[PDB]
Amino acid sequence: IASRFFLYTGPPHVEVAAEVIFDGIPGFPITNSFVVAIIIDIFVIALAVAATRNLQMVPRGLQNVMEFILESLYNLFRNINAKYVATAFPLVATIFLFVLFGNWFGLLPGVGSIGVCHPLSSVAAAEGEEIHDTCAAQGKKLVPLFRAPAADLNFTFAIAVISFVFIEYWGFRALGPGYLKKFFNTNGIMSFVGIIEFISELVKPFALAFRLFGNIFAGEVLLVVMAFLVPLLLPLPFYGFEVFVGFIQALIFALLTYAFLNIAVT
Amino acid sequence: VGALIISIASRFFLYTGPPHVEVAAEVIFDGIPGFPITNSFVVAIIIDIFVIALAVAATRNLQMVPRGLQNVMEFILESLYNLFRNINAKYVATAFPLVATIFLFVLFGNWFGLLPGVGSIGVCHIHDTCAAQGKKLVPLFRAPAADLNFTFAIAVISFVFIEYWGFRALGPGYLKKFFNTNGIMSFVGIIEFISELVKPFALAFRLFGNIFAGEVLLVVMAFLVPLLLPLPFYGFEVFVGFIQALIFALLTYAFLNIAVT
Amino acid sequence: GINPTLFIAQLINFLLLIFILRALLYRPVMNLLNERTRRIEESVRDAEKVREQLANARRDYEAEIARARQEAAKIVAQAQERAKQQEAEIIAQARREAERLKEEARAQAEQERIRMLSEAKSQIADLVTLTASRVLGAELQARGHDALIAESLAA
Amino acid sequence: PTLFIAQLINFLLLIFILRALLYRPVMNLLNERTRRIEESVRDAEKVREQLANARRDYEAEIARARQEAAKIVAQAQERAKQQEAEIIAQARREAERLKEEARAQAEQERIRMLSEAKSQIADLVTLTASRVLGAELQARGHDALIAESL
Amino acid sequence: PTLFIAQLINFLLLIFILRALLYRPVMNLLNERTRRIEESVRDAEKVREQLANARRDYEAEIARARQEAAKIVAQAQERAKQQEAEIIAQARREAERLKEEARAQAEQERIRMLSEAKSQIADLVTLTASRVLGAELQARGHDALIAESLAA
Amino acid sequence: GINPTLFIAQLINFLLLIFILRALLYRPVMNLLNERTRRIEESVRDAEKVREQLANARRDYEAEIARARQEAAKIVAQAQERAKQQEAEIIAQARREAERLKEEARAQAEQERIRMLSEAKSQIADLVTLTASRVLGAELQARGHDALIAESLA
Amino acid sequence: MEGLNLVATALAVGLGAIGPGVGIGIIVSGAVQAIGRNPEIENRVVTYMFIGIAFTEALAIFGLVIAFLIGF
Amino acid sequence: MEGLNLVATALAVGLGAIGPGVGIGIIVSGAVQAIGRNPEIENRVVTYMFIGIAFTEALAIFGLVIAFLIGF
Amino acid sequence: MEGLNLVATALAVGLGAIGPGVGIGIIVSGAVQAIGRNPEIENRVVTYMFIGIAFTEALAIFGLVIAFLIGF
Amino acid sequence: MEGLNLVATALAVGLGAIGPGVGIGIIVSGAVQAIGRNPEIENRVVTYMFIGIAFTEALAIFGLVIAFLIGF
Amino acid sequence: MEGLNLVATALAVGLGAIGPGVGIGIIVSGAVQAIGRNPEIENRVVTYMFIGIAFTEALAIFGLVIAFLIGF
Amino acid sequence: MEGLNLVATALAVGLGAIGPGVGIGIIVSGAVQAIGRNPEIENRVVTYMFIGIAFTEALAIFGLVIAFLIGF
Amino acid sequence: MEGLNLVATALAVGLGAIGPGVGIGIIVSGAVQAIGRNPEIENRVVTYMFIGIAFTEALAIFGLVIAFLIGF
Amino acid sequence: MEGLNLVATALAVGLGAIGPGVGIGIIVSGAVQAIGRNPEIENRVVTYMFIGIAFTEALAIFGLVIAFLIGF
Amino acid sequence: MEGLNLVATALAVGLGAIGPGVGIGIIVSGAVQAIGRNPEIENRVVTYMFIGIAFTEALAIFGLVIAFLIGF
Amino acid sequence: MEGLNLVATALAVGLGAIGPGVGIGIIVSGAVQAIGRNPEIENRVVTYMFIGIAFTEALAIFGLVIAFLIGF
DSSP: OOSOOOOSSOOSSOOOOSOOBOOOOSSSOOBSHHHHHHHHHHHHHHHHHHHHSSOOSSOOTHHHHHHHHHHHHHHHHHHHOSSSTTTSHHHHHHHHHHHHHHHHHTTSTTBTTOBOOOOOSSOSSSSSOOOOOTTTGGGOOOOBSBOOGGGSTTHHHHHHHHHHHHHHHHHHTTSTTHHHHHSSOOSTTHHHHHHHHHHHHHHHHHHHHHHHHHHHHHHHHHHHHHHHHOSSSSSHHHHHHHHHHHHHHHHHHHHHHHHHHHHHHO | OOSOOSGGGTTTTSOOOSOOOOOOSOOEEEOOSSSOEEHHHHHHHHHHHHHHHHHHHHTTTOOSSOOTHHHHHHHHHHHHHHHHHHHOSSSHHHHHHHHHHHHHHHHHHHHHTTSTTTTTOEEEOOOOSGGGSSSOEEESOOOGGGOHHHHHHHHHHHHHHHHHHHHHHHTTHHHHTTGGGOSSTTHHHHHHHHHHHHHHHHHHHHHHHHHHHHHHHHHHHHHHOSSSSSHHHHHHHHHHHHHHHHHHHHHHHHHHHHHHO | OOOHHHHHHHHHHHHHHHHHHHHHHHHHHHHHHHHHHHHHHHHHHHHHHHHHHHHHHHHHHHHHHHHHHHHHHHHHHHHHHHHHHHHHHHHHHHHHHHHHHHHHHHHHHHHHHHTTOSTTTTOOHHHHHHHHTTTTSSSSOSSOOSHHHHHHHHO | OHHHHHHHHHHHHHHHHHHHHHHHHHHHHHHHHHHHHHHHHHHHHHHHHHHHTHHHHHHHHHHHHHHHHHHHHHHHHHHHHHHHHHHHHHHHHHHHHHHHHHHHHHHHHHHHHHHHHHHHHHHHHHHHHHHHHHHSTTTTTTSSSSSSOO | OTHHHHHHHHHHHHHHHHHHHTHHHHHHHHHHHHHHHHHHHHHHHHHHHHHHHHHHHHHHHHHHHHHHHHHHHHHHHHHHHHHHHHHHHHHHHHHHHHHHHHHHHHHHHHHHHHHHHHHHHHHHHHHHHHHHHHTTSSSSSSTTTHHHHHHO | OOOHHHHHHHHHHHHHHHHHHTTTTSHHHHHHHHHHHHHHHHHHHHHHHHHHHHHHHHHHHHHHHHHHHHHHHHHTTTTTTTHHHHHHHHHHHHHHHHHHHHHHHHTTHHHHSTTGGGGGTTHHHHHHHHHHSSSSSSOOOSOTTSSOSSTTTO | OOOHHHHHHHHHHHHHHHHHHHHHHHHHHHHHHHHHHOGGGHHHHHHHHHHHHHHHHHHHHHHHHHHHHHOO | OOSHHHHHHHHHHHHHHHHHHHHHHHHHHHHHHHHHHOSTTHHHHHHHHHHHHHHHHHHHHHHHHHHHHHHO | OOTHHHHHHHHHHHHHHHHHHHHHHHHHHHHHHHHHHOSTTHHHHHHHHHHHHHHHHHHHHHHHHHHHHHTO | OOOHHHHHHHHHHHHHHHHHHHHHHHHHHHHHHHHHHOGGGHHHHHHHHHHHHHHHHHHHHHHHHHHHHHHO | OTTHHHHHHHHHHHHHTTHHHHHHHHHHHHHHHHHHHOSTTHHHHHHHHHHHHHHHHHHHHHHHHTHHHHOO | OOOHHHHHHHHHHHHHHHHHHHHHHHHHHHHHHHHHHOSTTHHHHHHHHHHHHHHHHHHHHHHHHHHHHHHO | OTTHHHHHHHHHHHHTTSHHHHHHHHHHHHHHHHHHSOGGGHHHHHHHHHHHHHHHHHHHHHHHHHHHHHOO | OOOSSHHHHHHHHHHHHHHHHHHHHHHHHHHHHHHHHOSTTHHHHHHHHHHHHHHHHHHHHHHHHHHHHHHO | OTTHHHHHHHHHHHHHHHHHHHHHHHHHHHHHHHHHHOSTTHHHHHHHHHHHHHHHHHHHHHHHHHHHHHHO | OOOHHHHHHHHHHHHHHHHHHHHHHHHHHHHHHHHHHOSTTHHHHHHHHHHHHHHHHHHHHHHHHHHHHHHO
C-alpha cells in the first residue's frame, strides 16, 4: 500500500503568486483568470442550453439534474426569505453556478502546469524533487495559463461589489429613507450600534471577497505544495477536501449575499 | 479591631532585611564526623518524639468512653478509617499504618513551620546575628516536608508499598499488566508504565513545592511589612499544610486502590 | 494584483453572464410554477370529478328508489282493481245463480206435488185397505158403510 | 512538465474513488426523485383522462340504470299478471263451489219437501180414517166388538 | 534576629484568631461524639442488665408454672376422690331405696294376690253353686218358678 | 540535595516510625474501637434475644398450664373412673336382690295352693246355705246331692 | 535586524483570527441550539444572530485592515 | 529599531480584537438562547444585549484609538 | 530609539480589552438568560449585572490609566 | 534578526489555526446537539452550521493567506 | 533600553487584568443564575459572590501592587 | 539570528496543533453526547461530525504544510 | 540585558494570575449554582469550594513568590 | 545564535501538549457523560471516542515529530 | 544576556499557574454541582475529586521543580 | 545569548502543563458529573476516566522528559 511513494518524478519547487497577466499581444490584455472565466462562461451557457433545448415533463438526465439543483437552491433561499426568493434568484443562482465551476476547474491537470512564457535530475537525499520545468530556457517562470478564476482578487472583488450594490439597491428599493434611520439614529445607545452596523455594512464586500479568494488560493497552493512533497498517493484525501470546500464555499457565498439581502430588507 | 490600622508602616521600625531564606538544600546543625545531622533530620527526630509522647499520653489507659485528648486522638483515626473504607473495601487493614503514619508525620511537619524561629533561630555556620561575626548563619528547625531526602523517602516507600500490594493482589499478571492485547492496550501499556514511574516523583515534589512556597511566602510577606499583612498567608499555610498531608495520604491509598483493581 | 481595468472587464463579463442566465433562469421559474399549478389544480379537479361521479351514483340510487316505488304502486293498483272486479263477480254470480237454483227447485217441487191431486194418486186404495182390513175386520164390517165413507174419502 | 503526470494520475485516482464511493447514492437519489415526479405526472394524467371520460360514463350509467328500470318494470308486470290470475282463479273456483253447494241445498230441500209431503198425506190418512169410523159407526158399532174376547 | 518579634506576634495573633473562631466548633463536635459513645455504651449495659433480669424472670415464671401445675394436679386428685366417694354413696342410697321399695311392693303384691285368691274362691263358689242348682231343678222346680215370675 | 546518606537515614527513621506506631497507636486503640463496635452489635442482637426470651417465657407458662390441664384430665380417671361402673354394678346387684325377694314373695303361692284344704268346713257350708237361701224361696227343700261330683272343682 | 513589519502584520492578522473565531463559533452554536429548541422564533433569531456576527467578524476585519496597512 | 511602532499598533489591534470578539460572541449566544426560551421578554433583553455590546466593543474601540494614535 | 513605550501602551490597552471583554460577555449572557428565565426579578439582577460590570471594566480602566502614564 | 519572515509566517498560520479551530469545534458540537434533540429541524440547522463554519474558517484563511504573502 | 521597564509595567497591570477579569464574569453569571432559580437564597449567595470577587480582585490588586512598584 | 527557522517551524506546528486539537475534542464530545441521548440518529449525525473534523484537521494540516514549506 | 529582571517580575505576577483567576470564577460560580438547588447542603459545598480556592490561590501566590524573589 | 534550536523542541512539544491535552480532556469527559446518561450504547460510544482520541493524538504526535526532527 | 534565568523561572511558574488553576476551578465546580444535584453520593465522589485535585498540581509543581533548577 | 537552555526548559514544562492541567480538570469534572447522575455504571465510568486521564498527562510527561533532555 505504502510501497510506491516515488518522488523521483516531481516538481522542483512551488510557484505561488497573485493573478498573472496573460501574454495578450493586442491591447486590453486578458489575464490567466480572464480566459478561464470565459471558458466557464461557455461551459455554463452550454449546460444551460442543453437543459433548455429539450424541456418537457418527467425530466431525465442533465435536465433533471439542473432542475433538482435549481429547486434545492430555491428551497434553501425560501427558508431565509420567501418574499424575495423568486425575485433575487438569478444573481445568487449565477454566483453559485459560477463559483462552483471556478473552484472545480482548479483541480484540472494543466492548472499550474501549462505555460505560455509570455530521477537523475532530481535532488537525492531530499523529500522534494528538483526536476526543472520545460521553459527553464530563457529563464522564464512558466506562467500558468490556467489559474482558477476565484483565486484572483479582481473577479472576486467584482462579484463582491455587485453583491454590495445589489443589497443596497434592493434594500433602498423598499425601505424609504430608513437606512439613515437604522444607522446613527441618536436614540439612546442605539447610535453606537448603528455606527458599528454601518461599518460592518461597509466591510461586508471586502470580507466576502477576501474570504472566497483566500479560500481558493489556499486550496490550490496546498495542492501544489503537497504534490511537491510527494507527487502520488498523498494528496487524494486533500484533493477531495479541496473540491468539497470549493463547492461548499461557492454555496456559502450565495447564501451570504441572500442573507445580507434579507437582513437589509427586514 | 478597627480597619484604620496605623501599624501598617512597621517596616520602618522593624526591618528584617533581605529574605535570607532561599536554601533549597540541607544545612548541617551539628558537626559529626560520621553521618551529618541536617536541619530537617533534627526536626524529624523532634516530631517523632512529639508523636511518641502523644501516643503514650493517648493510649496509657485506653479507657472506654473517649474523653479529652483520647477523643481527639481517636477521632482522626476513625475519620481516616472511614475515608479509606470509602476508597477501598478490604485493603485498609493492610495499608492503614503506612498511610496514617505519613499523614500524621507530614501534618506535624507542615504545622511546625509556623512556630517562630524556623527562619529566625539558627546557628553561626537587617543583618541578623551571625552576620555581625564572621560566621555565616544557617537557620534551625527547617520543616521536614521541605527536605527532599524526606519527601523522596516517603515517595519511594509509597512506591514500594503500592508495587508490593499490586503484585501480591494480582499475581504475576500485574508484573506485565496486559501488554499482550495488541489491539487496545499495547501503546497504552507503556503510557501507564511511565505514569507509574512519574507518580512518586510528583508525590514528593508536591509536598516539596507546597511547603517551600509556604515558608518563602511567610518570609517575603514579613519582608514587605512584618505586621498584619502576612496573617492571611499564615492562616492559608496552616490550612494548606493539613490539606497537603490529607491529599498525600488519600492519593497514596487511592493509587493502591487503582493498582489492586 | 490591483488593476481597475481588469476589474471593470470582470464586472462587464458578469453583467453579460447575469443577463444571459437571467433569461435562462426566467425560463424554469414558470416551468416549475406551471408544473406546480398543474399538480394542485389537477388534484382539486380530481377530487371534483370524484364528487361528480358520486353525484351520478346518488342520482342512480334516487332513480332506483323512485322506479321501485312506482312499480310497486302500479302493481298494487292493478291488483286491487282486478280484485274489486272479481269480488263483484263472485258475489254477483253467486247471489243470482243461487236465487235461480232455489226458484227452479221450488218450481219443480210444485210440479212434483201437483200430480198427486187426482183420485188414484190421492191414495184411495190403501185408504180402503186400512179401513177394511187393518181395523181388525174383513171389509166395511161393524162400523162400516159405503156412501158417506167414500164421500169423506173424496174429502 | 513533470507535474502534469502527477496531476493526471491524482485526478484519475480521485475520480475512481469518488465514483466507487458516491456514484450509487447520487443516481439512487436522482432516480428516486424522477420516479416521484414520474408517478405524480403519469398516474395523475391517467386518472385525469379516466375521470374526464367519466362525464360521458355518467350518461352511460344513466342508460344502464334505465335498462335496470326496464327489466324491473317487466318483472313487476309479470308478477302482477300471475298474481292477478291466481286471485281470479281462486275467486272463480270458490264461485263454482258456491253454486254447487246451492245445488246441494236445493236437493236437500227437495228431500225435506217430499218428507213433509208424505208426513202430511200420512196424517191426512189418519184423519180420514178417524172421520170414516166416526161418521158411520152406526152400522154395527158398539156391539160384538166392545168385548172382542177380552 | 528582628524577624523573631514579627514571627511571634503573627503566630500569637493567629492562635488567638483560631481559638476565637475554631475552638468552639471542635469542642462541640468532641462533646457530641463523646455523648454518643457514652449513650451507646450505657444502652448496651442496660440491654445486658435487661437480658439478665429477663433470664431470672423466665426461671421464676417456669418455677411458678410448675408450682401451679402441682397445685392443679393435687386439687384435681382431691376433687376426683371426693366425687368418687360421693357417687358411691349415692349408688348405695339408690340401692337401699330400690330394695326397700321392691320389698314393700312384693309384700303389697302378696296381699293383693291373697285378695285375688279370695276372689277366685268366690267365683268358684258361684260356679259350683250354679252346678248344684242345675241338679234337683230338672226333676221339679221348673214349675212354680215361671209361675212365680208370672205372678210378679 | 539528593545525598544518599540522608535518604537512607530518613527511610530508616520512617520505617522505625511505622513499625513503632503499629504497636502503640494503631493496634491498641483500634482493637478498642472494633471491640466497641462488636459490643454494639452484641447489644442489638441481645434486644431481639430479650424479646424472644419473653415470648418463650409466656409460651412455656401456657405450655406448663396446658400440661397441668392434661394431667388433671387424666387424673379424673384416678384409675377409679370405673366408680361409675361400681354404681352400675351396685344397681344391678340391688336389682338381682330385689328379684330374689320377689321370687321369695311369689313362693307364698306354695302355701296359697294349700288353701282349698278348708273345703271340708267352709266350701260345703256356704254351698248348702246358698241353695238354702237363694232361688228356692230361701228353703233347702232340694237335697241337692250335697257336694258336687267334682265337689269344689276337685 | 530584519523588518519588524512582517512580524507586526502576522501578529495582527493572527490575533484578529483567534478572537472573533471563537466569538462566531459561540454565536452560531447558541443560535442553532435555540433553533433546535424552538423553530417558531427562528427567523427573529437569525436576525440578531447575524447582527452579532456583523459585530464580531468586523473586529477581525479590522485586524486584517491593519495587516494591509503594514504589509503594504 | 524602526518597526516597533508597527508592532505596537498590530499588538493593540489584535488583542483588542480577541477580547471583545469573544465577549460579543458570548453575549449574543446567551441573548439568542434567552429569545428562544421566551420571546415575550425579547425586546426587554435585546437592548440589554446591545447595552452589553456597547461596553465590550468599546474596549475594542479603545484599542483602535491606541492604534490610530500610534500610527499618527 | 526607545520605542518600547509604544509597545508598552499597546500591550496595556490590548490586555485591558482582552480580559474585561470576555468578562462583560459572560456577565451579560448570564444576566439575560436569567432574566428570560424569570422576568419579574429582572431589575434586581440588572443592578447586579451592572455591579459586575462596575468591577470588571474597572480592571480595563486600570490598564487604560497605565497607558495614560505610558503613552502620555 | 535575519530570518524573521519565517517566524512571521509561522505566527500568522498558527494563530489563524488557533482561533477558528475552536470556532468550528464549538459550532459543530452545538449543531450536532441541536439535530440530536430535534431531527426534524435538520434541513436548516445544517445550512446554518455550514455558513457559521465558513464565517469562522475565513479568519484562518486570512491568516494563512497573509502568511503565504509574507513567505512568498 | 531602559524603556523595557515600561513594557514590564504593561504586562504587570495587563496580564493580571485578564485572568481574574473573565473569572469575575463567571462568578456574577453564576450568581445571577442563582437568583433566577431561587430568589429566597439570594442574599446569602450575594455575599458568597462578593467573597469570590474578594479573591479575584485581590489577585488583580496584586497585579497592580507590583505595577506601581515597577512603573511609579 | 540564524536558528530562527527551527523556532518558526516549532511555532507553526505547535499552534496549528493548539487550535484544531480543542476543535476536534469539542466536536467529538458534542457528537457522542448527542449519540447518548438519541442512538438511531447516529448514522446521520456522525457523518456531520466527521465533516467538522475534516475542517479542523485541515487547519492543522494547514500548519503542517507551512512547517514543511519553511522547513524545506 | 539589565532590564530583564523587571520583565521577569511582570511575567511572574501576570502569567501566574491567569489560571487562578478563572479558577476562582468557575469555582464560585459552581458553588453558587449548587447552593441554588438544595441550600441545606450549602455548608458542605462551602468546604471543598474554599479548599479549591486554597489550591488555586496557592498557584497564584506561587507565582507571586517568584516575583518577590526577582524584583528583590 | 548558539541556542534557538532546543527552544524549538521545547515550544513545539509544549504547544502540542497544550492543544491535544485539552482535546482529550473534553472528548473523554463528553464520552463519559454519555456513558452515565446512556449505558447500553457504550461500546459504539467507546469506539467513537477512541477514534477522536486518535484524530487528536496525531497532532500531538506531529509536535513530537518536530522534536525528533529538530532534536535529532 | 543576563537576566534570562529570571525570565525563564517567571515563565515556568506562570504557565504552571495557568494550567492547573483553571483545572481546579473546573474540578471543584463539577464536584460541587454533582453534590448539589445529589448529596448522598458526595462521600464516594469527593475523594475522586481530590485525585483530580492532585493530578493537575503535579504538573504545576513540576514547573517549580524546573523553576528551582533555574532558580538555583 | 547564554541562558537559552534555561528558557527552553521553562517553556517546555510550562507549555506542557498549560494544556493537560485543564484537560484533566475537564476529564474528572465530567466523570464526577456522570457518577452523580448514574452511580451504578460508576466502575466502568471510573475505568474509562482513568484511561482518558492516562493519555492526557502523558503529553505533559513528554514535555517533562523534553526538559530533562535539555536539563541534562
